[PDB]
Amino acid sequence: TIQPGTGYNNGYFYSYWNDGHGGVTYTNGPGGQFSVNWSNSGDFVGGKGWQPGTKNKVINFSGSYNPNGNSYLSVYGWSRNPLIEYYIVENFGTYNPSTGATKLGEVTSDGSVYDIYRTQRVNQPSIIGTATFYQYWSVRRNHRSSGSVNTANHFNAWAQQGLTLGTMDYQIVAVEGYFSSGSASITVS
Structure with a gap:
């Protein structure tokens, strides 16, 4: 594993964070590749991409x-x-x-319908410190672990629905876990 933090590896921004509970290892590989292996973890998120992201990136993952x-x-x-x-x-x-979130529409992109939702985090950690903020979701109906994501289709549908984005910060393909186990190996471009 590598140390939780952010940086660049083989041209790609990466972010790896955990809650210190243990049980998760994150590795940066060649190019846009990263791996995650976890067993009875706590809370964590890790992956590779861009800092800053853009509102019209086509993101490939496999x-x-x-x-x-x-x-x-x-x-x-x-x-x-x-x-x-x-x-x-x-x-x-x-x-x-x-689950339990307010549905804000649907969008079709990259071979599947996605359902759109908005949730709110209240006094929770964020890129700027503790804050209350919205989360926007597109949830793919047809699950997969390779493909292409035309982010503009999502961001445009969100905007249509009143879910406005500001200036982009980081933008990654991420494996997130909450007190679980698993393995993953993903290459981004």
């Missing part, structure tokens, strides 16, 4: 994703002003992150 418990595989990032945490969820484990 590999394997084998969660056992609560985990997501997503295009994941933030905007500033307004502060937004966003997800284009391509696959997940035992928990659909939109």
